[PDB]
């Protein structure tokens, strides 16, 4: 199917407790494959997936140098952002960055991303055209004017169309046993009376990959979106994910409810019910 590569940077200042922490993680789809932590005893870009380990010394050395440089750059950007928002040097602040590329089945660029936040709020984003910027406020507009002057968008576009897609393709090939394998959800419905005239039906999906899944309850064929309790999709720790959806139903009407499951690993959507 379609695939994505995404890097996530977090830079967190901590006045009185040294220089800002910088953590970078890299993902292909829902699979983390590299990490860098400036607080590690010996900071370096390190493997987090088996298929990335075959990359040679030049890869890891280059990526390590780059992550150290990026750490410095975003420490500086934290100071700059302090100035842009008229904030004191006493407080702790965070810059987050997510960037990367989406490609289709034929490996062609579907779209590129480079977006950042300051203290959890949108700061600046490369538009889909990979040529203009969306700044969330006047500070970010200052940054935008800087990046327009230096034609940063052109360089990012060069990265996203070239190296990003090429290396994503390389990774997809090297890890095709896992990255190009969908694991369908193992599904079942549980039933727990809460009272003499109400019962919870809980629709479970387990052991699926990738994380993207749709779990819905229908009553007499009508979607129960407003009445369905949906937990956040959560990692199992073995690359796979888990999710459930719960509905409270009148006792004796359980068979009027059906759970519908959509996932890439499934040839067709599933319908299941409580089976007493």
């Amino acid at each position: 199917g379609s695939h994505s590569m995404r890097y996530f940077y977090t830079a967190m200042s901590r006045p009185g407790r040294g220089e800002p922490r910088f953590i970078a993680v890299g993902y292909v789809d829902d699979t983390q494959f590299v990490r860098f932590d400036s607080d590690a005893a010996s900071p370096r870009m390190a493997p987090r997936a088996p298929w990335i380990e075959q990359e040679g010394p030049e890869y890891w050395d280059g990526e390590t140098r780059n992550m150290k440089a990026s750490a410095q750059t975003y420490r500086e950007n934290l100071r700059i952002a302090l100035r842009y928002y008229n904030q004191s040097e006493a407080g702790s602040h965070i810059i987050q960055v997510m960037y990367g590329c989406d490609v289709g089945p034929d490996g062609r660029l579907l779209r590129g991303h480079d977006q950042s936040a300051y203290d959890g709020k949108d700061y600046i984003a490369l538009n889909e055209d990979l040529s203009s910027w969306t700044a969330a406020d006047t500070a970010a507009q200052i940054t935008q004017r800087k990046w327009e002057a230096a034609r940063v968008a052109e360089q990012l576009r060069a990265y996203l169309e070239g190296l990003c897609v090429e290396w994503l393709r390389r990774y997809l090939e090297n890890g095709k046993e896992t990255l190009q394998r969908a694991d369908p959800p193992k599904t079942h419905v549980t039933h727990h009376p809460i009272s003499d005239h109400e019962a919870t039906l809980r629709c479970w999906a387990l052991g699926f990959y990738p994380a993207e899944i749709t779990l819905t309850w229908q009553r007499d064929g009508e979607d129960q979106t407003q009445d369905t309790e949906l937990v956040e999709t959560r990692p199992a720790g073995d690359r796979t994910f888990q999710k459930w959806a719960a509905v409270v139903v009148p006792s004796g009407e359980e068979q009027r409810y059906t759970c519908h499951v959509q996932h890439e690993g499934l040839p067709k959507p599933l319908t299941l019910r409580w089976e007493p």
Binding site: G26, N66, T73, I80, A81, D114, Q155, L156, Y159
Partner: peptide, 9 residues
Amino acid sequence: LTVQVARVY
């Protein structure tokens, strides 16, 4: 592979 583009805020 990570990006290498100068982006000072």
